[PDB]
Every structure is written in C-alpha cells, then in structure tokens.
Design a protein around this motif. Structure first.
Motif, PDB file in Angstrom:
ATOM      1  N   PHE A  22       0.882  -1.166   0.000  1.00 34.00           N
ATOM      2  CA  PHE A  22       0.000   0.000   0.000  1.00 34.00           C
ATOM      3  C   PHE A  22       0.918   1.215   0.000  1.00 34.00           C
ATOM      4  CE2 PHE A  22      -3.199  -2.924   1.310  1.00 34.00           C
ATOM      5  CZ  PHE A  22      -4.444  -2.301   1.189  1.00 34.00           C
ATOM      6  N   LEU A  23       0.694   2.148  -0.919  1.00 25.47           N
ATOM      7  CA  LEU A  23       1.507   3.357  -0.955  1.00 25.47           C
ATOM      8  C   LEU A  23       0.815   4.467  -0.174  1.00 25.47           C
ATOM      9  CD1 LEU A  23       3.989   4.840  -2.092  1.00 25.47           C
ATOM     10  CD2 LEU A  23       2.615   5.487  -4.062  1.00 25.47           C
ATOM     11  N   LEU A  24       1.524   5.019   0.807  1.00 27.78           N
ATOM     12  CA  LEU A  24       1.005   6.123   1.607  1.00 27.78           C
ATOM     13  C   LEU A  24       1.314   7.378   0.800  1.00 27.78           C
ATOM     14  CD1 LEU A  24      -0.216   7.236   4.188  1.00 27.78           C
ATOM     15  CD2 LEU A  24       2.064   7.198   5.195  1.00 27.78           C
ATOM     16  N   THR A  25       0.269   8.011   0.278  1.00 25.25           N
ATOM     17  CA  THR A  25       0.448   9.186  -0.561  1.00 25.25           C
ATOM     18  C   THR A  25       0.524  10.504   0.184  1.00 25.25           C
ATOM     19  OG1 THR A  25      -1.938   9.474  -0.922  1.00 25.25           O
ATOM     20  CG2 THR A  25      -0.757   8.021  -2.440  1.00 25.25           C
ATOM     21  N   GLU A  26      -0.060  10.546   1.375  1.00 25.00           N
ATOM     22  CA  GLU A  26      -0.080  11.775   2.144  1.00 25.00           C
ATOM     23  C   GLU A  26      -0.486  11.540   3.594  1.00 25.00           C
ATOM     24  OE1 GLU A  26      -3.076  14.405   0.568  1.00 25.00           O
ATOM     25  OE2 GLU A  26      -2.094  16.156   1.475  1.00 25.00           O
ATOM     26  N   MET A  27      -0.088  12.465   4.463  1.00 26.78           N
ATOM     27  CA  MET A  27      -0.412  12.400   5.883  1.00 26.78           C
ATOM     28  C   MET A  27      -1.183  13.675   6.205  1.00 26.78           C
ATOM     29  SD  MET A  27       3.300  11.038   7.200  1.00 26.78           S
ATOM     30  CE  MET A  27       2.953  10.434   8.848  1.00 26.78           C
ATOM     31  N   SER A  28      -1.948  13.657   7.292  1.00 24.40           N
ATOM     32  CA  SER A  28      -2.769  14.808   7.655  1.00 24.40           C
ATOM     33  C   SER A  28      -2.453  15.487   8.982  1.00 24.40           C
ATOM     34  CB  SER A  28      -4.246  14.404   7.640  1.00 24.40           C
ATOM     35  OG  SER A  28      -4.489  13.331   8.534  1.00 24.40           O
ATOM     36  N   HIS A  29      -1.399  15.051   9.664  1.00 23.59           N
ATOM     37  CA  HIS A  29      -1.045  15.676  10.933  1.00 23.59           C
ATOM     38  C   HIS A  29      -0.484  17.063  10.623  1.00 23.59           C
ATOM     39  CE1 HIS A  29       2.516  13.861   9.270  1.00 23.59           C
ATOM     40  NE2 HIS A  29       3.269  14.603  10.061  1.00 23.59           N
ATOM     41  N   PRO A  30      -0.490  17.968  11.609  1.00 25.39           N
ATOM     42  CA  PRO A  30       0.013  19.330  11.412  1.00 25.39           C
ATOM     43  C   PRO A  30       1.244  19.499  10.520  1.00 25.39           C
ATOM     44  CG  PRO A  30      -0.910  19.170  13.557  1.00 25.39           C
ATOM     45  CD  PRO A  30      -0.886  17.753  13.012  1.00 25.39           C
ATOM     46  N   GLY A  31       2.373  18.947  10.940  1.00 23.49           N
ATOM     47  CA  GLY A  31       3.596  19.091  10.164  1.00 23.49           C
ATOM     48  C   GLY A  31       3.612  18.589   8.729  1.00 23.49           C
ATOM     49  N   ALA A  32       2.557  17.900   8.310  1.00 23.16           N
ATOM     50  CA  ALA A  32       2.492  17.367   6.953  1.00 23.16           C
ATOM     51  C   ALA A  32       2.520  18.445   5.870  1.00 23.16           C
ATOM     52  CB  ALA A  32       1.248  16.498   6.791  1.00 23.16           C
ATOM     53  N   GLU A  33       2.135  19.673   6.203  1.00 20.64           N
ATOM     54  CA  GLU A  33       2.133  20.714   5.184  1.00 20.64           C
ATOM     55  C   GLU A  33       3.533  21.173   4.792  1.00 20.64           C
ATOM     56  OE1 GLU A  33       3.020  21.263   8.067  1.00 20.64           O
ATOM     57  OE2 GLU A  33       1.528  22.604   8.962  1.00 20.64           O
ATOM     58  N   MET A  34       4.517  20.915   5.647  1.00 14.48           N
ATOM     59  CA  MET A  34       5.880  21.338   5.352  1.00 14.48           C
ATOM     60  C   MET A  34       6.473  20.720   4.088  1.00 14.48           C
ATOM     61  SD  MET A  34       7.622  21.718   9.166  1.00 14.48           S
ATOM     62  CE  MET A  34       6.330  21.401  10.364  1.00 14.48           C
ATOM     63  N   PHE A  35       6.375  19.398   3.946  1.00  9.66           N
ATOM     64  CA  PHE A  35       6.946  18.724   2.778  1.00  9.66           C
ATOM     65  C   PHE A  35       6.014  17.709   2.108  1.00  9.66           C
ATOM     66  CE2 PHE A  35      10.367  19.551   5.917  1.00  9.66           C
ATOM     67  CZ  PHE A  35      11.086  20.508   5.207  1.00  9.66           C
ATOM     68  N   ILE A  36       5.261  16.966   2.909  1.00 14.61           N
ATOM     69  CA  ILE A  36       4.370  15.937   2.385  1.00 14.61           C
ATOM     70  C   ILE A  36       3.204  16.416   1.528  1.00 14.61           C
ATOM     71  CG2 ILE A  36       2.702  14.155   3.033  1.00 14.61           C
ATOM     72  CD1 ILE A  36       4.595  13.385   5.303  1.00 14.61           C
ATOM     73  N   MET A  41       3.506   8.714  -9.084  1.00 16.32           N
ATOM     74  CA  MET A  41       4.654   7.812  -9.105  1.00 16.32           C
ATOM     75  C   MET A  41       4.150   6.390  -8.869  1.00 16.32           C
ATOM     76  SD  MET A  41       7.817   7.616  -6.420  1.00 16.32           S
ATOM     77  CE  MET A  41       6.742   7.095  -5.078  1.00 16.32           C
ATOM     78  N   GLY A  42       3.259   6.235  -7.894  1.00 13.83           N
ATOM     79  CA  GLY A  42       2.708   4.925  -7.612  1.00 13.83           C
ATOM     80  C   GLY A  42       1.975   4.359  -8.815  1.00 13.83           C
ATOM     81  N   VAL A  43       1.144   5.181  -9.452  1.00 13.64           N
ATOM     82  CA  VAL A  43       0.390   4.737 -10.615  1.00 13.64           C
ATOM     83  C   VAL A  43       1.329   4.267 -11.715  1.00 13.64           C
ATOM     84  CG1 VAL A  43      -1.119   5.437 -12.506  1.00 13.64           C
ATOM     85  CG2 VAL A  43      -1.579   6.229 -10.179  1.00 13.64           C
ATOM     86  N   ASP A  44       2.347   5.070 -11.999  1.00  9.64           N
ATOM     87  CA  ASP A  44       3.291   4.720 -13.049  1.00  9.64           C
ATOM     88  C   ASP A  44       4.050   3.435 -12.731  1.00  9.64           C
ATOM     89  OD1 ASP A  44       2.459   7.027 -14.361  1.00  9.64           O
ATOM     90  OD2 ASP A  44       4.172   8.223 -13.695  1.00  9.64           O
ATOM     91  N   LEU A  45       4.090   3.063 -11.451  1.00 12.28           N
ATOM     92  CA  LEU A  45       4.777   1.850 -10.997  1.00 12.28           C
ATOM     93  C   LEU A  45       3.843   0.643 -10.878  1.00 12.28           C
ATOM     94  CD1 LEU A  45       6.957   3.223  -8.034  1.00 12.28           C
ATOM     95  CD2 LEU A  45       7.781   2.618 -10.311  1.00 12.28           C
ATOM     96  N   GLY A  46       2.572   0.834 -11.205  1.00 11.28           N
ATOM     97  CA  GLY A  46       1.628  -0.267 -11.122  1.00 11.28           C
ATOM     98  C   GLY A  46       1.095  -0.551  -9.727  1.00 11.28           C
ATOM     99  N   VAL A  47       1.305   0.376  -8.795  1.00 13.16           N
ATOM    100  CA  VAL A  47       0.804   0.189  -7.436  1.00 13.16           C
ATOM    101  C   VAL A  47      -0.720   0.122  -7.517  1.00 13.16           C
ATOM    102  CG1 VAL A  47       0.537   1.253  -5.160  1.00 13.16           C
ATOM    103  CG2 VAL A  47       2.752   1.311  -6.295  1.00 13.16           C
ATOM    104  N   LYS A  48      -1.313  -0.838  -6.814  1.00  9.42           N
ATOM    105  CA  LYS A  48      -2.759  -1.018  -6.855  1.00  9.42           C
ATOM    106  C   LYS A  48      -3.477  -0.673  -5.560  1.00  9.42           C
ATOM    107  CE  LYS A  48      -1.805  -4.817 -10.017  1.00  9.42           C
ATOM    108  NZ  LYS A  48      -1.745  -6.299 -10.167  1.00  9.42           N
ATOM    109  N   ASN A  49      -2.714  -0.487  -4.487  1.00 15.07           N
ATOM    110  CA  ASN A  49      -3.276  -0.184  -3.173  1.00 15.07           C
ATOM    111  C   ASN A  49      -2.695   1.116  -2.639  1.00 15.07           C
ATOM    112  OD1 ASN A  49      -4.626  -2.904  -2.892  1.00 15.07           O
ATOM    113  ND2 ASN A  49      -2.485  -3.544  -3.078  1.00 15.07           N
TER     114      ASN A  49
END
Lengths: 204, 204
Positions: free
Chosen positions: B117-131, B141-149
C-alpha cells in the motif's frame, strides 16, 4: 564537544545483518575498536527488540536505532518510548513528516535522557525525487528545533549540511568525510572484521 | 473489483494499542464485523513480530502492517521480507523516498504473493511542510509503478487522489469518505467495542 556523544575512534559500525548469531559475532570481534553500533529494523524485526539490550550487555556498546521514524506525532512518541525502553541510546528520525513529528521524538528523548538524530537526506537513487530538494530546509528545521545530532548523506553535500547545523552539532555520515562529520559509519567493509576495523581506524 | 482485496463491511480496524492483552481482546470482540486489521510498530516492537501470526490464527483476520517503510531499497526489501515472513498480508510504504525504494517493496510482495500500500499523504500538522506538496506526484509515481493499493489522508483531497489513481485502484482512508475510498479505517471509536463497530457498519 563535551556536550555531544563521544564515539570511540570516530567509527560507527552499521550492523545490518539479520541473523542474531552473525550480528553478535561480528560486533563482539570489533568491540575493542568500536563502542557505537547502529542497528536497524531488519535485525530487530527478525530477532526481536530484546537484541538491543543483548548488544549493550554483551559488549557495553552504545546502540543507535536506525529506524528512520516517519509517522504521526502520537505514533512517533510510542515508537521512541518502546525503543528507548528496550535500551537504545539514540534513535534516527526522518524530517520529511514535519516539525511536530520530530518534536514528538525529542519530547520522549528529553523525558528518558536519550538522543534523537535527524536524518536530513538520503543518497540512494530515488532520493532526488523529493528528499534532495527538501534536505536543506529539513536541516534548518532541525536547527530551529534544537536538534543536536544529525545523520548526513557527495562531499559537497556534507559540507553544506555542516554549514547549516553549525560547528557544535554532532554529525555522522557513511579523510574527506571526517573534515565535516564527527564520526563515519561503516558497514559491509567490516561485517562482510577485527582486522578491517583496525585498518580503517589506522587509516584515519 | 475482483482483483482487489475484499475488506469485510468496508471497515478496517486500526489496532494501535501497545498491550498484547488489550489488543487481542478488542480485535476478537469485533471479528464478526471486521476481517482486516492494521497493526503498527508500537504493538509489534513492544510485543514482538510473532503477534502478527497470533492475530491471523486467533481471528482469521487479514493483517496490514502500518510500518510506513521509508528506507533505502536494500533495507526496504529486508523489512518487507521479514514482515511478510511473519505473516503480514500487506505493508504500508512511504513514497517520499522515491521510486526505487517503493519498487524494492513491490519486488518482495511479488515474490511472496503479498500486497504493498503506498502512503500518498499524511494529515497531521507538520504534513504541510513537505508531504502535502509532494502528495500528487507521489500518487502519480505509484500509478506509473503499477501500485494497486493506496492509503489516503480533507474530503476534497481524497477526491483528488481517487482521480489520480483511477477507479480501479484500491483506496483506504481514516458516508462521504466511502464515496472515494473503498474502505474506511477506524481506531479509537472502537478500541477506546463490538457495539461501536456494529454501529459504524449499520451507519454506512
């Protein structure tokens, strides 16, 4: 620097083996040269967290848990607490999840008298996609947070990191290297031992 | 979709308790409603990786290891292999470290017949800095790699993610949510049980 960790011979062993017998054998054979060992999830997940205390008791070495913690604050807190409870002297944490996630680790380290190392950058192929571009800001984030220990990545990159974190901060990285880093991390060149370690130390 | 994981009642239990006794009690009490449980490092580091097999044997549930793997390729490979060897049906991996680090996980999942499963994003406060700023690119990137979850994070953000990964991909997230996600992840509202779970299911 008196306020920073003292690594024997400025050489840290990266014990990445997954087999307890092999891991213990190599570390014991080099304890006369190294007092700091970096252990990661491969070994811990395969043999159990109890292996951390085993390393410390059998060899009297400092253990840095190379877990690259990268979760939300609450979970980071729990991971750090469990890892320090298991005896780890320090833990390596990712900076990309943000400041709150790093502070959660710093809080537990503060309460338990342990250390947090901020991983500012990685050097494997895919690191250029997102990590390389955020490295400087992550290092600056660490500084603004009072982080005193850093794990760095390219000679010129190590120089840039040292510039951002200052001359006082403790920096470890995998002659040239030790001009910026306080200690070098060596893995395969040792565990893949006593003679190899002795040579590297004599080399520096 | 036939090619994707079937989660009973579209409800995944986020078992974040660190105590084995408490963890087992809650999960068993809701097994008639849920067949998929997400376990993380707090529980595993505190009680050992053997707890994964215990959950699967005692309850016959699918286990998703919420480890948010974020290391270099070689280490990611080892972490995944150890985790799947312990019985995990799937593992959650970070995308920030790049494509090679994700592919390392996909390779082991392919060889062992497990899921990533690819974690695409997080929602905790600090997530806006880089994530937050890299979320769309990580999903692509996941899609192009065939990731399905995928594991998603803001309702409108879930809509954006679903758009990038397509209608076929499997998406899980913590009424409106199930409009985009295939299953919802619930933690505290349950382990903090049987009645609570039943209500949520009856709700949707």
């Amino acid at each position: 620097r008196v306020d920073v960790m003292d690594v024997m011979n400025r050489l840290i062993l990266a014990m990445d083996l997954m087999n307890r017998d092999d891991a213990l054998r190599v570390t014991g054979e080099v304890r006369e040269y190294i007092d700091t060992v970096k252990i990661g999830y491969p070994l811990v997940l395969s043999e159990g967290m109890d292996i951390i205390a085993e390393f410390r008791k059998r060899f009297g070495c400092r253990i840095i848990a190379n877990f690259k913690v990268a979760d939300i604050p609450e979970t980071n807190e729990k991971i750090c607490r469990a890892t320090f409870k298991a005896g780890a002297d320090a833990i390596i944490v990712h900076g990309f999840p943000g400041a709150d996630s790093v502070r959660a680790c710093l809080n537990v380290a503060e309460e338990m008298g342990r250390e947090v190392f901020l991983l500012t950058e990685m050097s494997h192929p895919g690191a250029e996609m997102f990590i390389q571009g955020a490295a400087d800001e992550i290092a600056r984030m660490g500084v603004d947070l009072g982080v005193k220990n850093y794990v760095g990545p390219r000679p010129e990159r190590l120089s840039r990191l040292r510039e951002i974190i200052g001359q006082d901060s403790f920096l470890i990285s995998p002659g040239e290297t030790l001009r910026f880093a306080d200690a070098i991390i060596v893995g395969r060149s040792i565990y893949l031992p006593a003679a190899a370690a002795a040579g590297i130390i004599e080399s520096i």
